[PDB]
Design a binder for this molecule. Structure first.
Ligand SMILES: COc1cc2c(cc1OC)CN(CCc1ccc(-n3nnc(-c4cc(OC)c(OC)cc4NC(=O)[C@H]4CC(=O)c5ccccc5O4)n3)cc1)CC2
Ligand SMILES: COc1cc2c(cc1OC)CN(CCc1ccc(-n3nnc(-c4cc(OC)c(OC)cc4NC(=O)[C@H]4CC(=O)c5ccccc5O4)n3)cc1)CC2
Lengths: 1169, 225, 220
């Protein structure tokens, strides 16, 4: 898991290696720039000091002339550094951008060259996160951090070299102090660089119950765990709060320690330097230049660690992409060493074919199948689901290879001939097709390259899918939505048949081509299928026997092996399995957030005080620095000079200690108030969303994951929106206001001159800060807005592995990649220019300020201590203003966040779950009466699913509801359970209308089983224990319900039997077992009204009886309503209701519906026996 | 441990120019001022001026301005003082001294150059006039009978005087020389006993470099003259 | 333009006792800040002057502590404790509080303060080479005299000689450690004859009486 460095710089041109070399040279130059500026600064301040000393003796002419000369060194260094910085940044960014574009295109090629078996095992999203995260990490690992790394190493080396060639004594002292300085700068950059992932994990620990309660929305009011899930969520928030508090405390400890160390080093270095300057051994400019070069060098070598971090990350993230690109499959679509026939005649040969799925290789579905199919032979295969008809279809197109035997098509085997040429000539429709979300002309064009619209019209008229083309607008320009959601299912399957038929194939393979289709359209589709079957070989897999009776050969699967063979009458005169089949068939808010942290006002007041002191900490440094220099700018007694120097060293130390305390306090207090606000806001938004109705979440914009992300991000952004603006404003005021004032008092002219520069210096500071770690994410946003095509061509590997059109989607990916690449190059150039210009203006401020200062000193208008004060108080004031106002989070998105949070908190549901008001009778009977009830979905207001049904249910009346899939089966459940209230109709619950009753009482009395069993992230004892709430749950009822649901055996078998931790949605254990535990979880409710919705969807035949015996012994006393597709619970039901498009067609006893032969008898004579 | 040292004597003629050199070792040259100070003979010291060893800025006393120029050589760590048309009044001993730039007259002149004596002169080399002296005529002082040998009007210095080629180390008295009207003068005495004079030889010796006259002269007993 | 005055131009001191040298400033040597700057330096014959005591009463690093300095206003003093033989040179003081032009003092030499005695006058008739060359040079040696402030007088026929004569004041000897000087009267052969008496004496403190030793041009 550590790529060798040479392997990553693969895909590098010669132009890119030239870019890298020249960028490294420019980076070294721009790095070594700064210690030379310190050199010139030392020489210049020495000039000023000697002029002052002499003019205080003779009690200023050559001063102006020598400053004239030094301005030229300043300007030269400024220009050279501007050029070197521009070159370094632009060249490194261009090299990395082009290299990463090449990497990404070649990686997509590799991820396309694979096979479905290698793609069906790995997760689909895994490759998505691999692409985005891995590629962006490779980009940042080689983009610029190498530039800044070499620049910081150059600054360190040149700084120590200058410090040694000037004076080696103070240099050895600052060297002895240097390792702790480097460590402090490294840790301080390390904690300011990321500031996201640790708090993200601290919240992710709690994101589990978030995803729990937002992944189980419907069943959560039946479970009624709102109070309990809210308690557990409060616990998780408490732990997250404690971890975040410890984070803030330790981070601010490290910050304060770094600043205390900086200031103690200032104190020691000035103490020793002034000892030498007073002992005549050193000058003041010399001590200044030696100290500034060594201190800056140590800080830079400290700041060059995140480059190493990002490079290690880039190697680690490139390992997997290189392994993907490195892998070559046995069969390559791109490879042209495959063999291609010419006289392609339809002949199928399978002999001794054994194959198992590599996802589950322990189970063997197939145990040998031998077939020989001639041309024009319509072969159908019949059998139950589990034998693998779809397995045989996937075995045909060489999606895999059989482990035993050899398959052949017309003499020669598949294993020596080309895969793509074979893949284009077999037109296959799968069971559930997928449609790409383009126009329908492109969709029907997707078979082959050069198809004109006349062949399109002939193919769609063969498919009989031109009428719905005729009725909708944009008859070749209609953009079908995601996964065929815009159109209906029958139009979708008919145009899918068209999309296969445009290839003009040699072998046609249909797999369940008429699942959701009606009578006449399946008829005309099958007539068209016999219109094009005479030149081709065909295999049809279907459930309806209307299209099977007119075939050539019928065959039957049993346990994977094809057992029966022959024509219709041969299987009819043999009375086999199939015999039994045919015999049976015949914004809005503006700063109302100030009151959100109001209760923690001591934190706010101590924070504003500490911010005032931490802002004013700068002009005090200006004062002490200028005073300690002016002590050596004038003449005085040696002892007075030594006393002043010692006093100012002590003042440096004391200022450092104050800085430590105040940084700790401000950081801790603001972080603590922020975290308390985030906790109080997450708690409240979760409670207010739990108080909502099901109609609220069912809104199309109110999605689960989107809402957990809204919580995670906005509840942490609104804390900044309130605390950070105030803290930063106060910091910047106490930093720059008193600075401009003290400057105006002493030097009036130079203060105006530098006022004409402070904005650009602040801008340079903010830019340098945004460059230290993290500038912009917009490139990811462009790639994402253009990245859905790779997602869709990855997920739907199925259609692309057969259509033989992979290169077209690779070219589409290239067309998607083109324009962001041009924009990235233009942005690299612009960014280089801006960075260089800002740093150069920071380099030219020296020259301007000190030339005007020399002209002022020469004319007696001010001293040198004064110009030093104005400089160090105004220019560094503006630089600190920029540096600090950078770390502040921006304000517009924070405001939008607070607005939406307050909106959602403020929103109140029409029905309140916490209120007790309503009709509370002490008694009931258990009779339900629906009358003229109509319901339309709020997300689909134009489409009515109901047209006024009615129903009468009495005590103990086993009421079966039978109908088509999607005719309002669970809608009556949702009308009962107070999810949706209908616009019209009347529902009487024992002569008591549900709209006037208590809301929680109806949700307490009844108890259902969901359409899909969902459990929570705990053990099975807490799975069944969720069924009864606000009540002391007895374990005797737990074991009694586990015995009654016949899940007691599977619980008592498991180790840690009632403490066995179940994962998400019961993904560890099987579907029948979680269905039985859903039966046990509903069973503890003991409901007076019981509903079942698909009680035997995935369950064994011996388990259905042991589920139903508890139901039949407990159906007395309670009203029972079962909805299922299996007829075994429908035969013994009391009254049976058949639905048709929401309308009640037949009702009454089962013998009455069996007497009058209608649509129910149609479904009652399918598998009667 | 700071050591400045100067060039050495420079016997120049009138109306000429002469450069005096102060060389400083063992410390930082860039900081201190070098102060030039004059001293005539038998009089109080006198301040000439100062040169800034950093950039070469100067300040002159009122008397000496227009008669002296100060310059500095940083790469050689030396200071230079040059006259212009030096007169007879500039024969003296001159000194260079050190004074830091930060304190500036609130500190003493810590370290001094050794001093180099200038002498203005117009005369030229001369042969010494070795005069053989003799005691008082007739009477004796007893045991201690005195003798002597001297010179008059020689240029330039020095002169070495020994007695009996060094073999006489008894009753010998040496006295320094004196400059007068661009020439020199000397004298010396030796006391001997009666059994050493007029019983033994007593010879004075002179040696003037710019004349090479390694002359010797025995002092004889005086009779009628 | 302050003017320092160092009180004794010479201080007769012995070895084993102490002395004190005093400088008087014409102006007040305080400063507007509150410190007084008056430094004492030591100079040796043929060497460079060293710094003995800087500022008011402070001592320079690298000197013993025998030296001490105390003063007020316009009168300051130095003190040598346990005087030695090496620390015998010229001293001087230096003002630095008013420095348009730096100011120093006149200096002070030290003495050895030996036992007293009177010199032995020695006189010579002129040299034969001088009579041949037309000249006279009569020297008046005076050995073993003490202390080194004596005023001898050349006399001719009752007239004091003030021309062509100076005194060669030798310093104190090493072992015998007594003083000497040389007064030499010279004239041309013309006025050599117009006078007869070339009388030299030694007027000192050890003896007010002139110790006369003369000869006569004719008598020889
Ligand atoms: C220094 O100039 C340059 C600056 C820049 C460039 C190039 C530069 O060319 C040299 C180009 N990028 C380089 C990256 C970078 C960013 C910042 C710094 N910082 N260095 N110090 C401080 C500082 C931080 C304080 O806490 C927040 C603080 O408050 C207590 C005060 C300070 N400093 C000051 O106040 C003074 C006062 C003073 O007398 C002085 C004397 C000598 C030199 C600088 C001086 O600046 N930040 C150095 C490099 C971006 C910024
Ligand atoms: C996210 O959440 C948080 C947000 C916030 C905080 C905490 C958070 O945590 C939750 C607390 N605030 C942080 C705001 C802030 C802004 C800048 C700084 N920097 N200070 N220095 C440098 C510097 C940058 C260099 O380029 C990279 C560089 O390379 C050349 C060098 C340096 N440093 C230096 O040069 C020296 C030299 C020097 O003379 C000096 C003099 C005085 C004082 C320090 C000095 O340090 N940046 C410190 C804090 C607000 C926002």
């Amino acid at each position: 898991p550590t790529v060798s460095v040479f392997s990553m710089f693969r895909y590098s041109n010669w132009l890119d290696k030239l870019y890298m070399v020249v960028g490294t040279l420019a980076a070294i130059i721009h790095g070594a720039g700064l210690p030379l500026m310190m050199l010139v600064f030392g020489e210049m301040t020495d000039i000023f000091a000697n002029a002052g000393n002499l003019e205080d003796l003779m009690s200023f002419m050559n001063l102006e002339e020598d400053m004239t000369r030094y301005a030229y060194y300043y300007s030269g260094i400024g220009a050279g550094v501007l050029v070197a910085a521009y070159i370094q940044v632009s060249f490194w960014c261009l090299a990395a951008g082009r290299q990463i574009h090449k990497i990404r295109k070649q990686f997509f090629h590799a991820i396309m060259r694979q096979e479905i078996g290698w793609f069906d095992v790995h997760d689909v999203g895994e490759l998505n996160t691999r692409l985005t995260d891995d590629v962006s990490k490779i980009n940042e690992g080689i983009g610029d951090k190498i530039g800044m790394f070499f620049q910081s190493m150059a600054t360190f080396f040149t700084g120590f070299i200058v410090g040694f060639t000037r004076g080696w004594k103070l240099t050895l002292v600052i060297l002895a102090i240097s390792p702790v300085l480097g460590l402090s700068a490294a840790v301080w950059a390390k904690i300011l660089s990321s500031f996201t992932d640790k708090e993200l994990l601290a919240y992710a620990k709690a994101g589990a119950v978030a995803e729990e309660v937002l992944a189980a929305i419907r069943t959560v009011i039946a479970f009624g765990g709102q109070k309990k899930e809210l308690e557990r969520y409060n616990k998780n928030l408490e732990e997250a709060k404690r971890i975040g508090i410890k984070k803030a405390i330790t981070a601010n400890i490290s910050i304060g320690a770094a600043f205390l160390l900086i200031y103690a080093s200032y104190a020691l270095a000035f103490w020793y330097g002034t000892t030498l300057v007073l002992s005549g051994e050193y000058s003041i400019g010399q001590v200044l230049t030696v100290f500034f070069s060594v201190l800056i060098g140590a800080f830079s070598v400290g700041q060059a660690s995140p480059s190493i971090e990002a490079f290690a990350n880039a190697r680690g993230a490139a390992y997997e992409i290189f392994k993907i690109i490195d892998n070559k499959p046995s069969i390559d679509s791109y490879s042209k060493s495959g063999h291609k026939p010419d006289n392609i005649k339809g002949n199928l040969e399978f002999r001794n074919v054994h194959f198992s799925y590599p996802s589950r290789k322990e189970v063997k579905i197939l145990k040998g199948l031998n077939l020989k199919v001639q041309s024009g032979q319509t072969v159908a295969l019949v059998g139950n689901s589990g034998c693998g008809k779809s397995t045989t279809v996937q075995l045909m197109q060489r999606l895999y290879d059989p482990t035993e035997g050899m398959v052949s098509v017309d003499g020669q085997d598949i294993r020596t001939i080309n895969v793509r040429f074979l893949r284009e000539i077999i037109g296959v429709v799968s069971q559930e097709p997928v449609l790409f979300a383009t126009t329908i002309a492109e969709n029907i064009r997707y078979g082959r390259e050069n198809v004109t619209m006349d062949e399109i019209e002939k193919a769609v008229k063969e498919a009989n899918a031109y009428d719905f083309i005729m009725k909708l607008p944009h008859k070749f320009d209609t953009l079908v939505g995601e996964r065929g959601a815009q159109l209906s299912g029958g139009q979708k399957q008919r145009i899918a048949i068209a999309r296969a038929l445009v290839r003009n194939p040699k072998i046609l393979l249909l797999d369940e081509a008429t699942s959701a289709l009606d009578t006449e359209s399946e008829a005309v589709v099958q007539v068209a299928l016999d219109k094009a079957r005479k030149g081709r070989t065909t295999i049809v897999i279907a459930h309806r026997l209307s299209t099977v009776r007119n075939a050539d050969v019928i065959a039957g699967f049993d346990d994977g092996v094809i057992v029966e063979k022959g024509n219709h009458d041969e299987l009819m005169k043999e009375k086999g399995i199939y015999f039994k089949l045919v015999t049976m068939q015949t914004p809005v808010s503006f700063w109302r957030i100030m009151k959100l942290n109001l209760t923690e006002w001591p934190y706010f007041v101590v924070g504003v005080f500490c911010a005032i002191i931490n802002g004013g900490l700068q002009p005090a440094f200006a004062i002490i620095f200028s005073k300690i220099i002016g002590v050596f700018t004038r003449i005085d007694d040696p002892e007075t000079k030594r006393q002043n120097s010692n006093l100012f060293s002590l003042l440096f130390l004391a200022l450092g200690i104050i800085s430590f305390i105040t940084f700790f306090l401000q950081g801790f207090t603001f972080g603590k108030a922020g975290e308390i606000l985030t906790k109080r806001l997450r708690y409240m938004v979760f409670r207010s969303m739990l108080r909502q109705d099901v109609s609220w979440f069912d809104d199309p914009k109110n999605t689960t994951g989107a809402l957990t992300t809204r919580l995670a991000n906005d509840a942490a952004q609104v804390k900044g929106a309130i605390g950070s603006r105030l803290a930063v404003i106060t910091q910047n005021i106490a930093n720059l206001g008193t600075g401009i004032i003290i400057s105006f008092i002493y030097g009036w002219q130079l203060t105006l001159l530098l006022l004409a520069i402070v904005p650009i210096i602040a801008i340079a500071g903010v830019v340098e800060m945004k460059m230290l770690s993290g500038q912009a994410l917009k490139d990811k946003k462009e790639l994402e807005g253009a990245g859905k095509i790779a997602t869709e061509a990855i997920e739907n590997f199925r259609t692309v592995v057969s259509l033989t059109q992979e290169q077209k989607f690779e070219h589409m990916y290239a067309q998607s990649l083109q324009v962001p690449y041009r924009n990235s190059l233009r942005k690299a150039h612009i960014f280089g220019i801006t960075f260089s210009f800002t740093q150069a203006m920071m380099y030219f401020s020296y020259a301007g300020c000190f030339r005007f200062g020399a002209y002022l000193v020469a004319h007696k208008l001010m001293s040198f201590e004064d110009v030093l004060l104005v400089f160090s108080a105004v220019v560094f004031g503006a630089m600190a203003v920029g540096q600090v106002s950078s770390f502040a989070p921006d304000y517009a998105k924070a405001k939008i966040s607070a607005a939406h949070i307050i909106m959602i908190i403020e929103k109140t549901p029409l029905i309140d779950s916490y209120s007790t008001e309503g009709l509370m009778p002490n008694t009931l009977e258990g009779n339900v009466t629906f009358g003229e009830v109509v319901f339309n979905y709020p997300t689909r207001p134009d489409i009515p699913v109901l047209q006024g049904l009615s129903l009468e249910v009495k005590k103990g009346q086993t009421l079966a509801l039978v109908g088509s899939s999607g005719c309002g089966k669970s809608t009556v459940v949702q009308l009962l359970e107070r999810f949706y209230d209908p616009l019209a109709g009347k529902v009487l619950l024992d002569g008591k209308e549900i709209k006037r009753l208590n809301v929680q009482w109806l949700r307490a009395h009844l108890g259902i089983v969901s359409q899909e069993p969902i459990l929570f992230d705990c053990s099975i004892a807490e799975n069944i224990a969720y069924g009864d709430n606000s009540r002391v749950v007895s374990q005797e009822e737990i074991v009694r319900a586990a015995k009654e649901a016949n899940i007691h055996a599977f619980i008592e078998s498991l180790p840690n039997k009632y403490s066995t931790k179940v994962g998400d949605k019961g993904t560890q254990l099987s579907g029948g077992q979680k269905q039985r535990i859903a039966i046990a979880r509903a069973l503890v409710r003991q409901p007076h009204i019981l509903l079942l919705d698909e009680a035997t969807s995935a369950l064994d035949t011996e388990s259905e009886k042991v589920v139903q015996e508890a139901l039949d012994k407990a159906r007395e006393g309670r009203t029972c309503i079962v909805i299922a597709h299996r007829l075994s619970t429908i035969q013994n039901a009391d009254l049976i209701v058949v639905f048709q498009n929401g309308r009640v067609k037949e009702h009454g006893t089962h013998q009455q519906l069996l007497a009058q032969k209608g649509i129910y008898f149609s479904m009652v004579s399918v598998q009667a026996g | 441990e700071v050591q400045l040292q100067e060039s050495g004597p420079e016997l120049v003629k009138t109306g000429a120019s002469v450069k005096i050199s102060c060389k400083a070792s063992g410390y930082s040259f860039s900081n201190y001022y070098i102060h030039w100070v004059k001293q005539s003979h038998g009089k109080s010291l006198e301040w000439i001026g100062f040169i800034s060893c950093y950039n070469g800025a100067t300040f002159y006393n009122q008397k000496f301005k227009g008669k002296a120029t100060f310059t500095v050589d940083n790469s050689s760590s030396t200071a230079y003082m040059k006259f212009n048309s030096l007169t007879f009044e500039d024969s003296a001993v001159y000194y260079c001294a050190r004074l830091p730039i930060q304190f500036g007259n609130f500190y003493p002149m810590d370290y001094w150059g050794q001093g180099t004596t200038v002498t203005v002169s117009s005369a030229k080399t001369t042969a010494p006039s070795v005069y053989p002296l003799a005691p008082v005529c007739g009477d004796t002082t007893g045991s201690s009978v005195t003798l002597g040998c001297l010179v008059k009007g020689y240029f330039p210095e020095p002169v070495t005087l020994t007695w009996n080629s060094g073999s006489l180390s008894s009753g010998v008295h040496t006295f320094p020389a004196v400059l007068q009207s661009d020439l020199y003068t000397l004298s010396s005495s030796v006391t001997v006993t009666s059994s050493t004079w007029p019983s033994q030889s007593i010879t004075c010796n002179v040696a003037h470099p710019a004349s090479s006259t390694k002359v010797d002269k025995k002092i004889e007993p005086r009779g009628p003259t | 333009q302050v003017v320092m005055t160092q009180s004794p131009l010479s201080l007769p001191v012995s070895l084993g006792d102490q002395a004190s040298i005093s400088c008087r400033s014409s102006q007040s040597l305080l400063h507007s800040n509150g410190n007084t700057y008056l430094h004492w330096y030591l100079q040796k014959p043929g060497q460079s002057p060293k710094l003995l005591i800087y500022k008011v009463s402070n001592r320079f690093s690298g000197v013993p502590d025998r030296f001490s300095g105390s003063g007020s206003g316009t009168d300051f003093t130095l003190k040598i404790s346990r005087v030695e033989a090496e620390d015998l040179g010229v001293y001087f003081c230096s003002q630095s509080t008013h420095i348009p032009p730096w100011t120093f003092g006149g200096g002070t030499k030290l003495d050895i303060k030996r036992a007293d005695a009177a010199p032995t006058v020695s006189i010579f008739p002129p040299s034969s080479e001088q009579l041949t060359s037309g000249g006279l040079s009569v020297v008046c040696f005076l050995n073993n005299f003490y202390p080194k402030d004596i005023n001898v007088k050349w006399k001719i026929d009752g007239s004091e000689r003030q021309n062509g004569v100076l005194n060669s004041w030798t310093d104190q000897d090493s072992k015998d450690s007594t003083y000497s000087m040389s007064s030499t009267l010279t004239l041309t052969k013309d006025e050599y004859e117009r006078h007869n008496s070339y009388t030299c004496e030694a007027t000192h403190k050890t003896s007010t009486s002139p110790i006369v030793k003369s000869f006569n041009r004719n008598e020889c």
